[PDB]
Design a protein around this ligand. Structure first.
Ligand SMILES: *[C@@H]1O[C@H](CO)[C@@H](O[C@@H]2O[C@H](CO)[C@@H](O[C@@H]3O[C@H](CO[C@H]4O[C@H](CO[C@H]5O[C@H](CO)[C@@H](O)[C@H](O)[C@@H]5O)[C@@H](O)[C@H](O[C@H]5O[C@H](CO)[C@@H](O)[C@H](O)[C@@H]5O)[C@@H]4O)[C@@H](O)[C@H](O[C@H]4O[C@H](CO)[C@@H](O)[C@H](O)[C@@H]4O[C@H]4O[C@H](CO)[C@@H](O)[C@H](O)[C@@H]4O)[C@@H]3O)[C@H](O)[C@H]2NC(C)=O)[C@H](O)[C@H]1NC(C)=O
Lengths: 76, 48, 79, 37, 47, 151
């Protein structure tokens, strides 16, 4: 599910916030998840998804990335 | 001589208001260092 | 009545203006507000006039109230 | 938003000024004749 | 007298929030009457 | 601020507040009296430049007409101050006594200017005579200022 909220203000600004719920629908993982193996070997968890890129509007300003429990600093 | 012509009662009250007003501003402002440097989050274990 | 046929709109007050307006309006409001309080505390039953108090209060409220709006926009909390 | 460097300078300036003003208040208070009346 | 009476009504039916809402109005009127009455009594005593 | 829910009044506070209200009123009036001297001094300067006696005469009559009203008002308020038992009532009369000395000194300056324009008084002598009148006038003002603070 995704909820897209668009607010237009007469003071020269429109603010858009999108709430995204994401689920990985690939084959279910079986057995324990080894952090040590995952870091050490490139092949480990090859199906797993690490990151994705979003193409935003050219004029987008003050972009913020956060979660329910606080900010997330990993986005570039 | 502008300050002198004012009554002393005016001078004492004016200084009293200015000193107290500033002190309130400093008390609130000084506590914002964490919120600016880091995200606006609850701190410590007990507050949660 | 389509976007290309019609014109475009922007706020009359440009963004760069906002910092200057907020500072000027608030300072004027503050000066009158201080004057109102000092006059009230110093004044006594026989030394106070309603007409003077109303004029100072009304002027102070007008200047500061507009200044606050510019402050909110400058901060970015658009109404 | 203001950076932490700006906030620190601001805090120091206000505090120094405020303390000096309290010293000035002491000056007028003693200097006051009606206080001794 | 009414304010004291209100205590019993709270005992049977009202809750804390309702009792305060009525009490504030009743107290205000009682206070105004008391202040005017006391000033008159003070003048009589000092005469 | 207007509302007071008081029961028992304090006459001493009420009278003390009343005297202060009168005291500032007296202060304003005396300041106006000093201002009247300032206008009269300006009138003397105008008289010297123009050499027209009529201009000074109108200024003088205005001074003794407005000033006399101020003095009478000051005495009338002083009567109330004396009625309250304020110790200042003698002081305000004392200021008026000094004020009369200033008033005559101002008159002495006016006549000296008239003689200087007429040539009865030499400029070289006039400078010293004006200096003495102004210096004593300033000293009287200095006395008035201290007692005014005493109010
Ligand atoms: C709350 O959360 C929010 C959201 O997370 C926080 O804000 C976010 O903070 C992060 C912190 O890192 C910011 O990250 C910044 O991202 C940009 C974009 O990075 C991508 O593009 C780069 C562009 O590179 C181009 O050119 C090179 C060749 O030169 C090509 O290879 C590229 O393909 C591009 O064409 C690119 O370099 C980046 O690659 C890096 O990362 C990827 C993986 O993501 C690796 O594979 C790469 O090898 C490489 O490591 C990436 O693709 C970066 O440009 C920013 O880098 C600057 O800032 C870094 C510190 O943040 C610093 O380490 C870098 O050296 C660089 O430094 C900049 O500033 C320096 C002065 O201080 C200059 O000296 C220097 O030249 C440069 O200007 C950076 O990583 C997010 O932007 C930011 N997000 C938002 C929305 O604001 C927020 O802080 C949190 N609040 C908290 C915690 O309180």
């Amino acid at each position: 599910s995704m909820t897209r909220v668009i607010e237009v203000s007469h003071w020269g600004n429109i603010a858009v916030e999108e709430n995204v719920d994401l689920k990985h629908t690939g084959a279910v993982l079986k057995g324990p998840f080894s952090r040590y193996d995952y870091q050490r070997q490139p092949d480990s968890g090859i199906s797993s998804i690490r990151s994705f890129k979003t193409i935003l509007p050219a004029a987008a300003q003050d972009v913020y990335y956060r979660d329910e429990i606080g900010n997330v600093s990993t986005s570039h | 001589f502008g300050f002198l012509r004012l009554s002393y009662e005016k001078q004492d009250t004016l200084l009293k208001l200015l000193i107290l007003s500033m002190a309130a501003v400093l008390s609130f402002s000084t506590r914002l260092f964490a919120v600016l440097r880091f995200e606006s989050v609850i701190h410590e274990f007990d507050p949660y | 009545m389509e976007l290309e046929a019609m014109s475009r709109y922007t706020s009359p007050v440009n963004p760069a203006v906002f910092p200057h307006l907020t500072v000027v309006l608030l300072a004027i409001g503050m000066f009158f507000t201080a004057w109102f309080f000092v006059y009230e505390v110093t004044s006594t039953k026989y030394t106070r006039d309603i007409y003077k108090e109303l004029l100072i209060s009304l002027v102070a409220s007008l200047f500061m109230g507009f200044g606050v709006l510019f402050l909110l926009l400058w901060v970015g909390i658009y109404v | 938003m203001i950076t932490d460097v700006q906030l620190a300078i601001f805090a120091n300036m206000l505090g120094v000024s405020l303390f000096l003003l309290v010293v000035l208040y002491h000056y007028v208070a003693v200097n006051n004749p009606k206080k001794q009346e | 007298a009414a304010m004291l009476g209100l205590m019993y009504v709270y005992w049977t039916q009202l809750n804390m929030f309702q009792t305060l809402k009525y009490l504030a109005i009743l107290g205000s009127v009682t206070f105004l009457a008391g202040n005017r009455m006391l000033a008159q009594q003070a003048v009589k005593r000092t005469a | 601020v207007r509302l007071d829910f008081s029961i028992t009044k304090d006459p001493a506070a009420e009278a003390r507040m009343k005297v202060a209200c009168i005291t500032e009123q007296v202060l304003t009036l005396v300041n106006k009296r000093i201002g009247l001297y300032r206008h009269f001094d300006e009138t003397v300067n105008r008289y010297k430049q123009s050499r027209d006696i009529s201009t000074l005469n109108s200024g003088k009559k205005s001074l003794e007409t407005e000033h006399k009203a101020l003095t009478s008002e000051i005495a009338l308020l002083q009567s109330r101050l004396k009625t309250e038992g304020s110790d200042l009532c003698d002081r305000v009369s004392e200021m008026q006594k000094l004020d009369a000395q200033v008033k005559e000194l101002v008159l002495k300056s006016a006549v000296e200017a008239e003689r200087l324009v007429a040539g009865k008084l030499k400029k070289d002598t006039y400078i010293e005579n004006e200096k003495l009148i102004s210096g004593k006038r300033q000293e009287l003002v200095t006395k008035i200022d201290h007692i005014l603070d005493a109010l």
